[PDB]
Amino acid sequence: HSSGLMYTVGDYLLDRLHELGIEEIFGVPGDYNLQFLDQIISREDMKWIGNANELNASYMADGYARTKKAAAFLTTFGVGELSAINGLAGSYAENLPVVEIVGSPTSKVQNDGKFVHHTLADGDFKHFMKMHEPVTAARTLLTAENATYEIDRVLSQLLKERKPVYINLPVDVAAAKAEKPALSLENTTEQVILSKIEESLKNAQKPVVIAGHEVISFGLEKTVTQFVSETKLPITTLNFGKSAVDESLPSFLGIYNGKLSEISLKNFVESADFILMLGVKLTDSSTGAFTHHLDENKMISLNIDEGIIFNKVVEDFDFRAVVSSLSELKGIEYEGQYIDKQYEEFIPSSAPLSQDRLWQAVESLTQSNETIVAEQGTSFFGASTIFLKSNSRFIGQPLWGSIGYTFPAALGSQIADKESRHLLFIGDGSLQLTVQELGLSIREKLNPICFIINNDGYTVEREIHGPTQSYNDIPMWNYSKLPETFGATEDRVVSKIVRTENEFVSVMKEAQADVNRMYWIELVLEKEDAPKLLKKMGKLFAEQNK
Amino acid sequence: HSSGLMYTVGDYLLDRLHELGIEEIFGVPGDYNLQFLDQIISREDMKWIGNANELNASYMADGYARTKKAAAFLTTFGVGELSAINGLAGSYAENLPVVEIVGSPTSKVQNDGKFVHHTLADGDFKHFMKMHEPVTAARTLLTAENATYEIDRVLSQLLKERKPVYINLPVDVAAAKAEKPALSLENTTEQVILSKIEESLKNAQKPVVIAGHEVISFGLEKTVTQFVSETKLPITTLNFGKSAVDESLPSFLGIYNGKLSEISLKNFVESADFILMLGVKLTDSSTGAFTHHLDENKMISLNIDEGIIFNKVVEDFDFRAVVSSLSELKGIEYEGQYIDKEEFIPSSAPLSQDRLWQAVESLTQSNETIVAEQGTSFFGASTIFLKSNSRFIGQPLWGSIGYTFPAALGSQIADKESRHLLFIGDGSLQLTVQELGLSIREKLNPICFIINNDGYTVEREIHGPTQSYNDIPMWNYSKLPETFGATEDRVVSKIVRTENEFVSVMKEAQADVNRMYWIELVLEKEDAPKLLKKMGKLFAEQNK
Numbered sequence A: 001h002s003s004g005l006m007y008t009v010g011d012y013l014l015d016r017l018h019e020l021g022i023e024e025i026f027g028v029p030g031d032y033n034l035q036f037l038d039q040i041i042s043r044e045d046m047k048w049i050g051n052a053n054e055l056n057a058s059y060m061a062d063g064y065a066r067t068k069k070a071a072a073f074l075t076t077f078g079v080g081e082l083s084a085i086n087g088l089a090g091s092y093a094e095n096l097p098v099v100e101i102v103g104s105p106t107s108k109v110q111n112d113g114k115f116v117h118h119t120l121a122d123g124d125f126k127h128f129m130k131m132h133e134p135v136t137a138a139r140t141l142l143t144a145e146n147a148t149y150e151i152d153r154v155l156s157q158l159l160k161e162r163k164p165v166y167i168n169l170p171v172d173v174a175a176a177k178a179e180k181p182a183l184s185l186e187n188t189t190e191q192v193i194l195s196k197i198e199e200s201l202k203n204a205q206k207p208v209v210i211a212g213h214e215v216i217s218f219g220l221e222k223t224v225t226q227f228v229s230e231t232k233l234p235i236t237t238l239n240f241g242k243s244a245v246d247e248s249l250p251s252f253l254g255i256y257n258g259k260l261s262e263i264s265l266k267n268f269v270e271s272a273d274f275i276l277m278l279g280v281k282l283t284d285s286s287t288g289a290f291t292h293h294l295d296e297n298k299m300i301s302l303n304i305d306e307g308i309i310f311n312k313v314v315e316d317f318d319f320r321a322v323v324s325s326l327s328e329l330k331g332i333e334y335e336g337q338y339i340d341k342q343y344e345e346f347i348p349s350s351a352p353l354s355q356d357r358l359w360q361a362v363e364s365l366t367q368s369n370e371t372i373v374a375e376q377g378t379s380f381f382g383a384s385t386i387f388l389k390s391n392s393r394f395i396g397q398p399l400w401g402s403i404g405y406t407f408p409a410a411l412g413s414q415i416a417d418k419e420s421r422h423l424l425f426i427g428d429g430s431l432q433l434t435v436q437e438l439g440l441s442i443r444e445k446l447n448p449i450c451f452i453i454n455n456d457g458y459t460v461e462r463e464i465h466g467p468t469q470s471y472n473d474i475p476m477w478n479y480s481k482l483p484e485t486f487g488a489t490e491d492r493v494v495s496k497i498v499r500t501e502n503e504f505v506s507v508m509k510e511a512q513a514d515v516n517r518m519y520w521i522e523l524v525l526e527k528e529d530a531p532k533l534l535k536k537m538g539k540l541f542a543e544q545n546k
Numbered sequence B: 001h002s003s004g005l006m007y008t009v010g011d012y013l014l015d016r017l018h019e020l021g022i023e024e025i026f027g028v029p030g031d032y033n034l035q036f037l038d039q040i041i042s043r044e045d046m047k048w049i050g051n052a053n054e055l056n057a058s059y060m061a062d063g064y065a066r067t068k069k070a071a072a073f074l075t076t077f078g079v080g081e082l083s084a085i086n087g088l089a090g091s092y093a094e095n096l097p098v099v100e101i102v103g104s105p106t107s108k109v110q111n112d113g114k115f116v117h118h119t120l121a122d123g124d125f126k127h128f129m130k131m132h133e134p135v136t137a138a139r140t141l142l143t144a145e146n147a148t149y150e151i152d153r154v155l156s157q158l159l160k161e162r163k164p165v166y167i168n169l170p171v172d173v174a175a176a177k178a179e180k181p182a183l184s185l186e187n188t189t190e191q192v193i194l195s196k197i198e199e200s201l202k203n204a205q206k207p208v209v210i211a212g213h214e215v216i217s218f219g220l221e222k223t224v225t226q227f228v229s230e231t232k233l234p235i236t237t238l239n240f241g242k243s244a245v246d247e248s249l250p251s252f253l254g255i256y257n258g259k260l261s262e263i264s265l266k267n268f269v270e271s272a273d274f275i276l277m278l279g280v281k282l283t284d285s286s287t288g289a290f291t292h293h294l295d296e297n298k299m300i301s302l303n304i305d306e307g308i309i310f311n312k313v314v315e316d317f318d319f320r321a322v323v324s325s326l327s328e329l330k331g332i333e334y335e336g337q338y339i340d341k342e343e344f345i346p347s348s349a350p351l352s353q354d355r356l357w358q359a360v361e362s363l364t365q366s367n368e369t370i371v372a373e374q375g376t377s378f379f380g381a382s383t384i385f386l387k388s389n390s391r392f393i394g395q396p397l398w399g400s401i402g403y404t405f406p407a408a409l410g411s412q413i414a415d416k417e418s419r420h421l422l423f424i425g426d427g428s429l430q431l432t433v434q435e436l437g438l439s440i441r442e443k444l445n446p447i448c449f450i451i452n453n454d455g456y457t458v459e460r461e462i463h464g465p466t467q468s469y470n471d472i473p474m475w476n477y478s479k480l481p482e483t484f485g486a487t488e489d490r491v492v493s494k495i496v497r498t499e500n501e502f503v504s505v506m507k508e509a510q511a512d513v514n515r516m517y518w519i520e521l522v523l524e525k526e527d528a529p530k531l532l533k534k535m536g537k538l539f540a541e542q543n544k
């Protein structure tokens, strides 16, 4: 004790999760995990945060992982795990270190082949783990004797690749005896790679660094930011991995998005004489539908699973080790120009809110040490191009792109860093998929600023195909009234409806000033209104489907 | 004159769905399915009914299947289909004929291995179909050259087994040319089975029939009901397959649930000299945690996959064909007795669980469908005797909480003339509440009871009665319809606390066929119906 005044498999698992930095476990209870849940409740160093449903729990764990750099959630066998699998798939796609724990029937029930609840009544308890093979880096069915090695094996794989892993935990196994961990869980080609990077950077007249999502996966943002700060090297990111570096760096150019990039940024990146890509994946939504021009002949790219050194593929290196050794490089100093930074100002009028003006206002009014979370739809595509301030971050999911993700994800991220004020931008259509975590937000007394874009349906989809087709319409809820209906009082959540630019600035300032309450702001915009980038990207998506 | 002087693969699929009797398609749009969606919207013979999310869409299609006897839903590649997979798993477990259509990127995009949205950015577009293998009877990724063959193959498997099937439909493939279908979709072993059943029923002095969920799967309820009515044979069902026969039959004994059965029913079933089981599976929640006593030496059981004739296994038979030939058997008439069959008088007393289900039993009418969610609702409602032409939807094998709300709406869409009564707990409603918008848009008139007992009471009864994980955030449930956009001409919302209030509101609801009823029932967290008090401890022992 600080004052100076049987261990089980369940304790071992929880101790290892604590080592990973996890202080909160998400999910939904079931009879097959209640005894292990008791162990979670008893922990002084970690909190159970129960969700309304398992898909939302998986999304929430993903957001938490993006900020905390590790996460865990708990489901019940069959019905819980299968409800969550789309969230885990997203975590695999965008490479987030999430542990799913699945409580399963006792070893004896499984071995007896009993037709119990949450099964297909065929006595086979292994179908569901098999179904997770494509979306997990490692998976295990624990036994009393295998538990400590199996837990360590799969969590070591989480540390190695920062992809999700899967632990099936039978009821009786969690209660079985174990002993405390003895040790914690935590170069030639690597040194060659560093020498070639050093040589290339020093010889380059116009170098450019491109940082991506795998930097975020490994929590290497501060490391890359420091490297770029010290060397003054020009840097850009895709919208996939936005905030992989601090956007207040003087050498940060903006977001490269193929032919949809700002012209001066596009010209700079595409005329660079050397390109260093760190943890980047080029996807449709992050390259203006594959209209990027990045010359492999002038490039060294480093990813988790491979590196390409001027066209030579290498696999025998550690991505984290190489990136962390970049500030052993001395004497690299860019002496050229960057591009002109446009002046950021927003002067409101009484005009009704429009998309392009909305994002101009958000850019101006967002502060340092805030996290912007933006949903697929007008929100992602508008917010993607805003210049973030010092120590500010971004969460978007452009590869997996599961609408509804951002609401639970914003809440998980907000729990992960209570000192970083989260601003959520989510569409009306997207909120309807995951709205039930509003209850959790109230119970946990979270204080994010949530903006719900009521544009009477799926505007991003209207921009791609069938602008006046009925399938792009949704039932209109009274969005501003949701907190009250879900049990919130005025001293917990402040709810608003905003129609004009003047109203938006007033509420935004009011919300930003009041750090001790959650804000729930219904923004009314026209269904035909889309931000400039989305008007362009919509037609590219449409072309891709022809 | 005086002088003497196109059809596509998408259309083909929709024509086949029409053939299956499907008039509504559920789901959620995505760019990879919008052009196929245009084809659905254009149809005169079926309607797109868009859901809030895909899990709910799969649940809704399942409920629709239970009543309509076939169903379809549409998702987008990756994110849509994986969101729905728990619903499809439940349809596989409980054997419902649901078709999932997944809209996927163009064949060119797939062949080029492009890193497009809703993928793992590895160029592989086959992972998600593989993930469906254990929960589908058949699956296909359509090409322009195999599309009609493959549609017919998988829909024929749906007809054969009545389990869910899966069709991945690339954008360009749906728009590819096709020709209208040339053919419609559709032994001694069966004769021996029928003869052995006939002989056993002829010679039996105390036969009993047990009907199960696979009867519901094949739409054989009326067939089995007719057979039992003609022969006067004693019949029971498990709670898994409740309403596989009409419960108003004179020879309907009640629900057999192992040692938790009513004593006279248990004694009757377990002393029968011959047992005929039709489409039954014995599961923990449907046998009082495996405390049933059914002697295979006295039994002929028929299932979709397998038949057992006095311990001898048979497989070369058509389950539907055999069940459909039972009314042709002769010299079968039961001449014995059954088992012996209180007026419900309400008071101002606060609502309690056992009294609630007594009231429901007394007030339920003919031509209703009762839907009951895992929790106090299922365990209470499962023993109510249904009136004539009334049905039940419960999911005791798969047991996914939240299922019943979308399922109840889907079933209600499937049969507009059966008034649906839903009993769902507060904890369960919180998983699937967003389909309230759909119910309002579609002007559905079910009667919905939400059991507000301040958390997960069934779980409290199993383990940790005062542990914080059994608590949930309390919503103002009665206010949900209003907040989701309902007006008073569409939904009537109320909070009910007493027995008098309950009888009044249920009667009021049943009398008003033109509006939806949304009724919050207030009960204590410690209160559970008698069956659940027992089952809670049996689950606890099962997890030792």
Ligand SMILES: Cc1ncc(Cc2c([C@@H](C)O)sc(CCOP(=O)(O)OP(=O)(O)O)c2C)c(N)n1
Pocket: A375, A376, A377, A378, A379, A401, A402, A403, A426, A427, A428, A429, A430, A431, A453, A455, A457, A458, A459, A460, A461, B028, B029, B030, B031, B054, B076, B079, B080, B083, B117
């Ligand atoms: C789980 C799921 N289902 C379906 C989709 C398809 C889809 C998107 C594809 C393109 O990813 S964008 C979109 C509409 C989002 O509408 P909104 O939230 O109202 O946003 P806004 O009106 O501001 O554009 C859908 C349904 C998806 N991405 N994820």
Ligand SMILES: Cc1ncc(Cc2c([C@@H](C)O)sc(CCOP(=O)(O)OP(=O)(O)O)c2C)c(N)n1
Pocket: A028, A029, A030, A031, A076, A079, A080, A083, A117, B373, B374, B375, B376, B377, B399, B400, B401, B402, B424, B425, B426, B427, B428, B429, B451, B453, B455, B456, B457, B458, B459
């Ligand atoms: C999708 C999902 N998640 C979790 C469970 C576990 C579970 C049940 C296991 C046993 O199936 S029963 C139950 C509580 C239901 O609570 P309620 O709806 O408030 O019902 P009541 O309070 O009336 O008992 C849960 C969470 C489940 N069945 N399905």
Ligand SMILES: [Mg+2]
Pocket: A377, A427, A428, A429, A430, A453, A454, A455, A456, A457, A458, A459
């Ligand atoms: Mg919208």
Ligand SMILES: [Mg+2]
Pocket: B375, B425, B426, B427, B428, B451, B452, B453, B454, B455, B456, B457
């Ligand atoms: Mg409850």
